[PDB]
């Protein structure tokens, strides 16, 4: 076999050959017999059973809280992934498999922050959602018993040429040249922090009114960024699904557009909404790029929903493809179906389970077999779709190590995208023999002191060169 | 390859002036090369930001630069029972600068304009304006093609057609060899964008101070459109010139429209009548394809080739991820009247948010091997995000895929090193063309001298 046809010098070197190899450190062994061989072959040579080194790769479960049946009550108790922690022992070039269960728990808490375009073009819609709060409460109540909702609004950067700046009256009333009245222009304003008191939403909306600016594309992306990174302001809860509902009837400004207003400073992705609840950097900072938006949405675990009118559906579907995980719904003309739109969007969001790995060591590689619908295994897949709320899926995972890394202990994480819970894998690379700890340096047995006596053989001590010094 | 990154020269402007935002080489009548630098936030007499221009003579030591003065006072003219008004506050004088012959053109794309008539008005808007100077003689002229005297009410009646009130003329600029000034005005026609062209000589011979509204009969502007593909396209965000139709008697225009067709982006090549010869479409929405354009023959066949920068292009990464790094496209001009076709080469940034392709500068033939070369800025690139400029050499098949040289920003974070670039001019007269790099965030300009190939 391959364990013998090598002539390895050490017990360490023997294990490195193959996971199948064992080592015999018994001092009372035939001088012709090889010390590196199969655990069986070694025993055939009367090798002391307590003198044989032969580690075996294993996977031991440390934490294994059962999956929850409900997501209500206390969030600290909610388990969506199981097991939560496992210990993994691997020897050189070996591999071991383990499983993970993921469930879309029923009655999980939900945050819905509603970001509304209140430019002039949106004039007609504002009346339809007069009581979106209560209606939205009635429907969502079937999917969750812990709903919080909030509200923000945007127009565009209040600076020329987006903003009308003459005559002086136009500043306080952009609809002056028309014989009507609207609010002064604003970039983004937070209105209602997320709350479970839905009538607060109804009453806040009833007091809202549109503004007016010059160019069709608006500044909603500024608002998406702020609603995302201004955590405390908006009130996102740690243990809840986050839905950021973006509604507009027009195209949008994007990074580098700001230069038409003389703005060249890149967006810094930081919160700039203070006590007055307005975006203070609206006139000094450029619109955010899609990449920066994606980074922050992912980091804060926020699901963006583009609920837009038919005339721009294709546009926002195309953006959606550039911001993975984003959902698009068609706002029927006058925001008359925005309620169901939101319910449906939430459905799509919890119909996917996709695993992602973090901090996986260079020398480790994983392979996945997914078990989604009706226990139908699907090889080489780490994501399931077409799921319903309450459905459970499992994944078979095989970890393979290539060689033996310098650091003998590392840990990586396997987690479903968007989920709070995760599976921590503690890897321990078993590359050394227990007998090495009993090594005798400068042993009289080896060249009268020029060598080390380890695992029943003589090794060249430190500082020497050549196999036999 | 052979730019010297060890011994640089630094020019500096006032704090907060954004000195270095734009720049160009300038030859006086005696053939001496200097550097014109735009500083769009320089303070005027009113103590407010108005912008300014500086003319830096060549000195290995660098240092401060003499100001190039322009009239910064607001103007008011009561004529024909109307009141014409110019507003130069925050106009951004020097947001672009260009030199042709013995003339310097410095633009203020955010100069505002209004016209009052009783209770009505045109609306106070950024028509933009350009200042022209003949430094040696002291002559001055202005050019502001988008100014009008039509009242707001009329635009409403015509569905805002031919609406030049937000042009921001001078946003970008270039001059033909024959001395025709071409201005990009991305806000033109209600944000479609437009180009305005006029001979420099005719601008000087038609201009008189105080008039504000006058005729330049030889001027030529592009046209409005009702094709929504063009809406909010910022056609004119960038411009360049070159030879693309086989007739050497005629100059063709290259125009960037970075948000064309719902932010797909586009670049167009047109004849001097604004008849389209080619359209290049962006590859990815929001990538800002057309942010920058450069014209130069890189493969030594005597035919100008096109380079397009898309600084926000997102490259595909593992696990279906996208990383904003920026990208540059090379299109080689074929023999005959054929179409440019697919890109001959794609150069892609590596640093996240680096904005590779923000600026692209012809260097001429830097290493003197018979093929023209380019420099590409990534203003926020480099391992520390301070900014990088990468040099790519020409070759028979186009450009090399890997940079021959990388210049790391010598300035602190946020300098925007590489936002503006200009090459292809031998400033120290050593027989090798040199490179100037603006870093407006630090209010400085860095000069890199080319040296014999090591």
């Amino acid at each position: 076999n391959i364990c013998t046809t090598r002539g390895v010098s050490s017990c360490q070197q023997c294990l490195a050959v193959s996971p199948m190899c064992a080592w015999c450190s018994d001092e009372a062994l035939p001088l012709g017999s090889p010390r590196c061989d199969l655990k069986e072959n070694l025993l055939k040579d009367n090798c002391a059973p307590e003198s044989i080194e032969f580690p075996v790769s294993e996977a031991r479960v440390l934490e294994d809280r059962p999956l929850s049946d409900k997501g209500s009550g206390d969030s600290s108790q909610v388990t969506q992934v199981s097991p939560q922690r496992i210990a993994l022992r691997l020897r050189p070039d070996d591999s071991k498999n383990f499983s993970i269960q993921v469930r879309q728990v029923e009655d999980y808490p939900v945050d819905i922050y509603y970001l509304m375009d209140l430019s002039y073009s949106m004039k007609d819609d504002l009346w339809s959602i007069q009581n979106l709060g209560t209606k939205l409460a009635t429907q969502m109540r079937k999917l969750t018993s812990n709903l919080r909702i909030g509200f923000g609004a945007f127009v565009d950067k209040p600076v020329s040429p987006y903003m009308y700046i003459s005559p002086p009256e136009a500043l306080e009333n952009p609809c002056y040249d028309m014989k009507t009245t609207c609010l002064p222009m604003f970039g983004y304003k937070h209105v209602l922090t997320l709350t479970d008191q839905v009538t607060r939403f109804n009453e806040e909306v009833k007091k809202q009114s549109v503004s007016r600016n010059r160019d069709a594309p608006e500044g909603g992306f500024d608002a998406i960024m702020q609603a995302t990174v201004c955590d405390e302001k908006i009130g996102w809860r740690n243990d809840a699904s986050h839905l950021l509902v973006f509604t507009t009837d027009a195209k949008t400004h994007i990074a580098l557009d700001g230069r038409l207003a003389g703005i060249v400073q890149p967006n810094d992705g930081q919160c700039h909404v203070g006590s007055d609840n307005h975006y203070s950097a609206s006139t000094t900072m450029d619109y955010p790029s899609l990449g920066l938006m994606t980074e922050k949405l992912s980091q804060k675990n926020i699901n963006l929903i583009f609920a837009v009118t038919e005339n721009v559906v294709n546009l926002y579907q195309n953006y959606s493809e550039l911001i993975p995980g984003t959902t698009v719904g068609v706002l029927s003309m006058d925001s008359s179906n925005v309620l169901q739109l939101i319910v449906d969007a939430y459905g799509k969001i919890r119909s996917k389970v996709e695993l992602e790995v973090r901090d996986l060591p260079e020398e480790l590689s994983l392979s996945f077999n997914a078990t989604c619908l009706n226990n139908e295994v699907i090889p080489g897949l780490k994501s399931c779709m077409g799921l319903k709320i309450g459905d459970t899926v499992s994944f078979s995972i095989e970890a393979k190590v290539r060689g033996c890394p310098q650091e003998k202990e590392k840990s990586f994480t396997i987690k479903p995208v968007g989920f709070k819970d995760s599976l921590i894998v503690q890897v321990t690379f078993d590359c050394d023999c227990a007998c090495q700890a009993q090594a005798e340096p400068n042993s009289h047995r080896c060249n009268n002191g020029n060598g080390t006596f380890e695992c029943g053989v003589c090794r060249c001590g430190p500082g020497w060169l050549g196999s036999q010094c | 390859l052979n730019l010297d990154p060890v011994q640089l020269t630094f020019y500096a402007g006032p704090n907060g002036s954004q000195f270095g935002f734009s720049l160009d080489f300038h030859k006086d009548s005696h053939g001496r090369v200097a550097i014109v630098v735009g500083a769009p936030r320089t303070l005027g007499p009113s103590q407010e930001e108005t912008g300014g221009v500086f003319l830096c003579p060549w000195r290995a030591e660098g240092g401060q630069c003499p100001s190039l003065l322009f009239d910064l006072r607001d103007e008011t003219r009561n004529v024909g029972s109307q009141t014409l008004q110019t507003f130069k506050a925050r106009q951004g004088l020097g947001a672009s600068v260009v030199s042709w012959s013995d003339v310097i053109v410095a633009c203020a794309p955010w100069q505002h304009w209004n016209v009052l008539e009783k209770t009505e008005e045109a609306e106070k808007t950024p028509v933009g304006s350009c200042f022209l100077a003949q430094p040696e003689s002291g002559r001055r002229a202005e050019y502001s093609p988008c100014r009008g005297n039509t009242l707001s009410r009329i635009y409403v009646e015509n569905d805002f057609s031919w609406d030049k009130r937000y042009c921001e003329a001078g946003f970008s600029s270039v001059v033909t060899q024959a001395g025709e000034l071409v201005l990009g005005a991305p806000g033109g026609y209600y944000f479609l964008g437009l180009l305005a062209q006029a001979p420099v000589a005719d601008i000087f011979s038609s201009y008189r101070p105080g008039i504000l509204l006058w005729h330049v009969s030889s001027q030529s502007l592009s046209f409005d459109s009702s094709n929504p593909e063009y809406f909010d396209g910022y056609w004119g965000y960038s411009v360049a010139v070159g030879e693309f139709d086989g007739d050497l008697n005629t100059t063709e225009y290259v125009v960037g429209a970075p948000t064309w067709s719902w932010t797909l982006g586009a670049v167009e090549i047109l004849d001097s009548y604004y008849q389209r010869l080619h359209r290049l479409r962006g590859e990815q929405m929001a990538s800002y394809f057309g942010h920058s354009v450069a014209v130069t023959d890189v493969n030594g066949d005597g035919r100008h080739d096109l380079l397009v920068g898309a600084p926000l292009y997102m490259e595909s990464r593992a696990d279906r991820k996208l990383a904003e790094v920026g990208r540059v496209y090379l299109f080689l001009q074929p023999r005959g009247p054929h179409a440019l076709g697919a890109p001959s080469l794609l150069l892609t940034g590596t640093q996240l948010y680096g904005r590779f392709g923000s600026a692209i500068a012809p260097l001429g033939d830097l290493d003197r091997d018979g093929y023209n070369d380019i420099a590409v800025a990534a203003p926020y690139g480099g391992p520390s995000g301070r900014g990088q400029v990468l040099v790519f050499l020409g070759q028979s098949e186009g450009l090399r895929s890997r940079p021959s040289q990388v210049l790391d920003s010598p300035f602190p974070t946020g300098s925007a090193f590489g936002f503006s670039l200009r090459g292809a001019v031998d400033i120290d007269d050593n027989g090798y063309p040199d490179l100037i790099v603006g870093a407006y965030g630090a209010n400085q300009v860095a000069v890199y001298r080319a040296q014999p190939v090591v």
Partner: peptide
């Protein structure tokens, strides 16, 4: 129109 209007 091509501006901010219904």
């Amino acid at each position: 129109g091509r501006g901010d209007s219904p």
